Short mmCIF file of N, CA and C in Angstrom, two decimals:
data_model
loop_
_atom_site.label_atom_id
_atom_site.label_comp_id
_atom_site.label_asym_id
_atom_site.label_seq_id
_atom_site.Cartn_x
_atom_site.Cartn_y
_atom_site.Cartn_z
N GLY A 1 -36.17 2.87 -8.94
CA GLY A 1 -35.12 2.43 -8.05
C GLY A 1 -35.12 2.61 -6.63
N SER A 2 -34.23 2.38 -5.77
CA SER A 2 -34.13 2.23 -4.29
C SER A 2 -34.23 3.82 -3.73
N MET A 3 -33.63 4.66 -4.52
CA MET A 3 -33.73 6.06 -4.18
C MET A 3 -34.61 7.10 -4.87
N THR A 4 -35.42 6.37 -5.74
CA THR A 4 -36.31 7.12 -6.74
C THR A 4 -37.22 7.94 -5.95
N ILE A 5 -37.85 7.31 -5.00
CA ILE A 5 -39.01 8.23 -4.21
C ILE A 5 -38.23 9.07 -3.45
N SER A 6 -37.14 8.81 -2.70
CA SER A 6 -36.38 9.78 -1.94
C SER A 6 -35.86 10.85 -2.53
N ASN A 7 -35.58 10.88 -3.98
CA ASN A 7 -35.14 11.73 -4.76
C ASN A 7 -36.38 12.64 -5.19
N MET A 8 -37.41 12.12 -5.50
CA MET A 8 -38.59 12.85 -5.81
C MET A 8 -39.00 13.79 -4.76
N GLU A 9 -38.85 13.16 -3.41
CA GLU A 9 -39.23 13.99 -2.36
C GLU A 9 -38.36 15.22 -2.27
N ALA A 10 -37.06 14.86 -2.30
CA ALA A 10 -36.17 16.07 -2.20
C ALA A 10 -36.23 17.13 -3.26
N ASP A 11 -36.42 16.50 -4.61
CA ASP A 11 -36.63 17.46 -5.83
C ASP A 11 -38.18 18.27 -5.39
N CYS A 12 -39.05 17.60 -5.01
CA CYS A 12 -40.49 18.47 -4.94
C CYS A 12 -40.16 19.44 -3.72
N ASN A 13 -39.31 19.12 -2.68
CA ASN A 13 -39.12 20.00 -1.55
C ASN A 13 -38.36 21.27 -1.97
N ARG A 14 -37.50 21.20 -3.07
CA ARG A 14 -36.76 22.18 -3.66
C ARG A 14 -37.68 23.38 -3.88
N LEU A 15 -38.78 23.28 -4.39
CA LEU A 15 -40.05 24.05 -4.55
C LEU A 15 -40.30 24.93 -3.41
N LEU A 16 -40.03 24.47 -2.27
CA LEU A 16 -40.34 25.14 -0.97
C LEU A 16 -39.27 26.28 -0.82
N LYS A 17 -38.07 25.92 -1.28
CA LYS A 17 -36.91 27.03 -1.18
C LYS A 17 -37.16 28.27 -2.03
N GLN A 18 -37.83 27.76 -3.31
CA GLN A 18 -38.12 28.81 -4.39
C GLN A 18 -39.30 29.61 -3.73
N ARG A 19 -40.24 29.11 -3.03
CA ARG A 19 -41.28 29.95 -2.39
C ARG A 19 -40.73 30.94 -1.41
N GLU A 20 -39.81 30.40 -0.64
CA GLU A 20 -39.37 31.07 0.70
C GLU A 20 -38.55 32.18 0.00
N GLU A 21 -37.66 31.88 -0.90
CA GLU A 21 -36.80 33.05 -1.43
C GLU A 21 -37.70 34.17 -2.09
N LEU A 22 -38.59 33.90 -2.85
CA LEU A 22 -39.49 34.90 -3.61
C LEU A 22 -40.46 35.49 -2.76
N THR A 23 -40.80 34.83 -1.53
CA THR A 23 -41.76 35.33 -0.58
C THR A 23 -41.01 36.60 0.14
N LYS A 24 -39.70 36.16 0.48
CA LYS A 24 -38.90 37.32 1.30
C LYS A 24 -38.56 38.49 0.32
N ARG A 25 -38.24 38.17 -0.94
CA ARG A 25 -37.98 39.12 -1.78
C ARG A 25 -39.13 40.02 -2.19
N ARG A 26 -40.32 39.46 -2.11
CA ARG A 26 -41.60 40.24 -2.21
C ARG A 26 -41.93 41.01 -0.85
N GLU A 27 -41.50 40.54 0.26
CA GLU A 27 -41.54 41.12 1.52
C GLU A 27 -40.46 42.30 1.54
N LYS A 28 -39.45 42.21 1.02
CA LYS A 28 -38.30 43.40 0.96
C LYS A 28 -38.97 44.41 0.18
N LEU A 29 -39.48 44.13 -0.88
CA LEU A 29 -39.98 45.15 -1.63
C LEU A 29 -41.32 45.96 -1.09
N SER A 30 -41.99 45.18 -0.14
CA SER A 30 -43.21 45.78 0.48
C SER A 30 -42.92 46.75 1.39
N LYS A 31 -41.86 46.50 2.28
CA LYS A 31 -41.24 47.41 3.20
C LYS A 31 -40.62 48.51 2.51
N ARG A 32 -40.15 48.24 1.46
CA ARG A 32 -39.40 49.50 0.64
C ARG A 32 -40.54 50.37 0.03
N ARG A 33 -41.62 49.91 -0.54
CA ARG A 33 -42.56 50.71 -1.17
C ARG A 33 -43.23 51.51 -0.18
N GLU A 34 -43.47 50.86 1.07
CA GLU A 34 -44.35 51.52 2.14
C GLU A 34 -43.61 52.80 2.49
N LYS A 35 -42.38 52.66 2.45
CA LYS A 35 -41.55 53.84 2.99
C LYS A 35 -41.66 55.22 1.95
N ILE A 36 -41.71 54.66 0.71
CA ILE A 36 -41.65 55.72 -0.50
C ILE A 36 -43.12 56.42 -0.43
N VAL A 37 -44.13 55.58 -0.22
CA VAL A 37 -45.60 56.22 -0.36
C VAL A 37 -45.68 57.11 0.96
N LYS A 38 -44.87 56.67 2.03
CA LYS A 38 -45.09 57.30 3.29
C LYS A 38 -44.45 58.89 3.10
N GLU A 39 -43.40 58.86 2.23
CA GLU A 39 -42.58 60.17 2.06
C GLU A 39 -43.00 60.78 0.73
N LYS A 40 -44.48 57.88 -7.20
CA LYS A 40 -43.13 58.19 -7.33
C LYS A 40 -42.48 57.34 -8.27
N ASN A 41 -41.80 56.28 -7.61
CA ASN A 41 -41.13 55.22 -8.42
C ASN A 41 -41.74 53.82 -8.00
N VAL A 42 -42.88 53.89 -7.22
CA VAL A 42 -43.37 52.81 -6.69
C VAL A 42 -44.04 51.70 -7.85
N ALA A 43 -44.24 52.44 -9.20
CA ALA A 43 -44.77 51.59 -10.19
C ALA A 43 -43.86 50.40 -10.63
N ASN A 44 -42.51 50.69 -10.48
CA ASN A 44 -41.48 49.73 -10.83
C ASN A 44 -41.61 48.63 -9.60
N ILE A 45 -41.67 48.94 -8.39
CA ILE A 45 -41.93 48.02 -7.30
C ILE A 45 -43.17 47.17 -7.40
N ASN A 46 -44.38 47.86 -7.85
CA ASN A 46 -45.62 47.41 -8.09
C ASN A 46 -45.45 46.28 -9.11
N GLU A 47 -44.70 46.42 -10.14
CA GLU A 47 -44.73 45.59 -11.26
C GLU A 47 -43.85 44.35 -10.87
N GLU A 48 -42.79 44.47 -10.22
CA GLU A 48 -41.96 43.38 -9.75
C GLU A 48 -42.79 42.54 -8.73
N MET A 49 -43.35 43.29 -7.77
CA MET A 49 -44.26 42.48 -6.52
C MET A 49 -45.08 41.57 -7.26
N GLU A 50 -45.96 42.23 -8.22
CA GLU A 50 -46.92 41.47 -9.06
C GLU A 50 -46.43 40.17 -9.91
N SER A 51 -45.17 40.42 -10.23
CA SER A 51 -44.36 39.35 -10.85
C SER A 51 -44.05 38.12 -9.99
N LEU A 52 -43.59 38.64 -8.82
CA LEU A 52 -43.21 37.53 -7.72
C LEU A 52 -44.47 36.77 -7.19
N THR A 53 -45.63 37.53 -7.28
CA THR A 53 -46.88 37.16 -6.75
C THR A 53 -47.31 35.91 -7.64
N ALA A 54 -47.10 36.20 -9.15
CA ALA A 54 -47.58 35.26 -10.05
C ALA A 54 -46.62 34.05 -10.25
N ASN A 55 -45.49 34.00 -9.70
CA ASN A 55 -44.53 33.20 -9.71
C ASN A 55 -44.60 32.23 -8.30
N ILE A 56 -44.94 32.93 -7.28
CA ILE A 56 -45.47 32.27 -5.89
C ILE A 56 -46.63 31.46 -6.12
N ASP A 57 -47.61 31.97 -6.77
CA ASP A 57 -48.83 31.31 -7.03
C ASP A 57 -48.64 29.91 -7.94
N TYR A 58 -47.55 30.19 -8.92
CA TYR A 58 -47.10 29.12 -9.72
C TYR A 58 -46.45 27.93 -9.06
N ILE A 59 -45.57 28.40 -8.06
CA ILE A 59 -44.88 27.41 -7.33
C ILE A 59 -45.72 26.53 -6.29
N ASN A 60 -46.81 27.27 -5.91
CA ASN A 60 -47.75 26.60 -5.15
C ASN A 60 -48.52 25.48 -5.69
N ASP A 61 -48.87 25.86 -7.04
CA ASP A 61 -49.47 24.86 -7.74
C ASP A 61 -48.49 23.59 -8.02
N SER A 62 -47.20 24.12 -8.30
CA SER A 62 -46.33 22.97 -8.66
C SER A 62 -46.00 22.16 -7.42
N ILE A 63 -46.05 22.61 -5.98
CA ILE A 63 -46.08 21.97 -4.93
C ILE A 63 -47.15 21.13 -4.63
N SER A 64 -48.39 21.39 -5.05
CA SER A 64 -49.45 20.33 -4.97
C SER A 64 -49.45 19.49 -5.93
N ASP A 65 -49.06 19.82 -7.15
CA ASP A 65 -48.80 18.71 -8.24
C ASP A 65 -47.69 17.76 -7.99
N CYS A 66 -46.55 18.23 -7.40
CA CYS A 66 -45.30 17.45 -7.13
C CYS A 66 -45.75 16.49 -5.96
N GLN A 67 -46.21 17.02 -4.84
CA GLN A 67 -46.71 16.15 -3.88
C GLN A 67 -47.67 15.11 -4.11
N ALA A 68 -48.54 15.53 -4.90
CA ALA A 68 -49.73 14.56 -5.64
C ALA A 68 -48.95 13.43 -6.31
N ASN A 69 -47.96 13.70 -7.06
CA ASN A 69 -47.32 12.57 -7.82
C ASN A 69 -46.67 11.64 -6.81
N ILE A 70 -46.05 12.12 -5.72
CA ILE A 70 -45.46 11.27 -4.77
C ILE A 70 -46.46 10.41 -4.06
N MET A 71 -47.66 10.98 -3.85
CA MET A 71 -48.67 10.23 -3.16
C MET A 71 -49.05 8.94 -4.00
N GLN A 72 -49.35 9.40 -5.32
CA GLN A 72 -49.60 8.41 -6.30
C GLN A 72 -48.46 7.16 -6.30
N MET A 73 -47.11 7.55 -6.36
CA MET A 73 -46.15 6.76 -6.41
C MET A 73 -46.01 5.91 -5.21
N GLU A 74 -46.98 6.23 -4.12
CA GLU A 74 -46.44 5.59 -2.88
C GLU A 74 -47.79 4.89 -2.62
N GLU A 75 -48.71 4.92 -3.36
CA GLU A 75 -50.09 4.34 -3.19
C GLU A 75 -49.99 2.58 -3.45
#
């Protein structure tokens, strides 16, 4: 349709917000863990930061896939 490509763009770009939110969340845990080891319970932070990283990497693959499909749609 007329807005099909525009909608694809908007939907693919929602992935950027996922990445941003997860990146900051991972950063919040980094500065938090840094203070604890400076002064334990970092194992829980390590487990979550590693989860966030795996999801950030997943999103990055999704961005490449999504943008590639747009390129094919536009060719």
